Symmetry: C3
Subunit: 106 residues, 3 copies
């Protein structure tokens, strides 16, 4: 999928997790977010289109999705551990990783 | 290792998982698959040899092994949770990720 | 952070794990190591500064941190499963991955 579609999937599933009742719902949404994060790794964001495809900026962009996927996975572990409120709280904390990349490249 | 050798390790361990008796056999095979997937990330596949090393095609190739590694890890989690036949079925479902990359680059 | 700073974080937390009393101490250190491993993925190491940014050597370098992150995560799983001394021993075994990269690129 294109970058913007993956970002809509990330944003939409944050709100799903926010309103989730149980851990299965949280787990399903985090799974969808992890897939979107890795798929977004394939894209070139408009503000880096003039950069080398392996410039430091593009590497930082791509590695940002590795960091987000690993952080999504930490939240999933908390859900799989039955700790739903903790997984939700962790899913909210993902915004700091969302924001860090946006501040540089959105 | 060679790309071809990593693919043999992926294929061989998919059949090991299919015939496995118990969770330890599944987890050991999935561990070997994850290692092969990440090692295959280092390679340039013959059909992309005339492409730039960070062309969209090479990124898509490399990210495909991130996606496979994460999907392998999901199956390992199910095995770690004792859900053996669920892990085996998940390992069978990896073939859709195997085929998606093959369709494009094999 | 600097590549050098990330390497000191990996080294320091290996000794923290070696002396840890319980699983929360091991988990917290492994989390810091995984973060440093992925951040180190963004760097260009001195020995490869004259290589193209997606040369086979730079890919091998970056994928080495994917492999380390996954091995760190395997050790965390062992901690999260209460197997403290098994996680400590696994953290000690990470040195073979530290050494393999160092031999090529340090
Ligand atoms: C870099 C590593 C990013 C991470 C991590 C996240 N986002 Fe992002 N996002 C990024 C870019 C470069 C862009 C611009 C894309 C474009 O083509 O304009 C975006 C955009 C969004 C959007 C708006 C999409 C649009 O219509 O243009 C949203 C709603 C969004 N991002 C949400 C989002 C969330 C919730 C994230 C973490 C959970 C997140 N993004 C991570 C780069 C990166
Ligand atoms: C891209 C991201 C791939 C993924 C994911 C998987 N495979 Fe693959 N495979 C890929 C290529 C480009 C090639 C051709 C390599 C060559 O040098 O010809 C292959 C090849 C195979 C083979 C045959 C190996 C050979 O002797 O040439 C097998 C048996 C194979 N692949 C199996 C396999 C399985 C089971 C996968 C999922 C678990 C899988 N591959 C993923 C690229 C990619
Ligand atoms: C490549 C994939 C590496 C892996 C995996 C690890 N290290 Fe590393 N390290 C690497 C390079 C190219 C360098 C030299 C660059 C530099 O930072 O100087 C290093 C360096 C170190 C150092 C010295 C830091 C300094 O002040 O120069 C230490 C103490 C170190 N590395 C530790 C370390 C540990 C414990 C690792 C595994 C857990 C590890 N490194 C992995 C490249 C790579
Ligand atoms: Cl996950
Ligand atoms: Cl936007
Ligand atoms: Cl790259
Ligand atoms: Cl990568
Ligand atoms: Cl795994
Ligand atoms: Cl083939
Ligand atoms: Cl971890
Ligand atoms: Cu895990």
């Amino acid at each position: 999928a294109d970058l913007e579609d993956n970002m809509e999937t990330l944003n939409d599933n944050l709100k799903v997790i926010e309103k989730a009742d149980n851990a299965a719902q949280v787990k399903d949404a985090l799974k969808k977010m992890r897939k979107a994060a890795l798929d977004a790794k394939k894209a070139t964001p408009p503000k880096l289109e003039d950069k080398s495809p392996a410039s430091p900026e593009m590497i930082d962009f791509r590695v940002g999705f590795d960091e987000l996927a690993w952080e999504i996975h930490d939240a999933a572990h908390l859900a799989k551990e039955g700790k739903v409120k903790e997984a939700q709280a962790a899913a909210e904390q993902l915004k700091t990783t969302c924001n860090a990349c946006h501040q540089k490249y959105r």
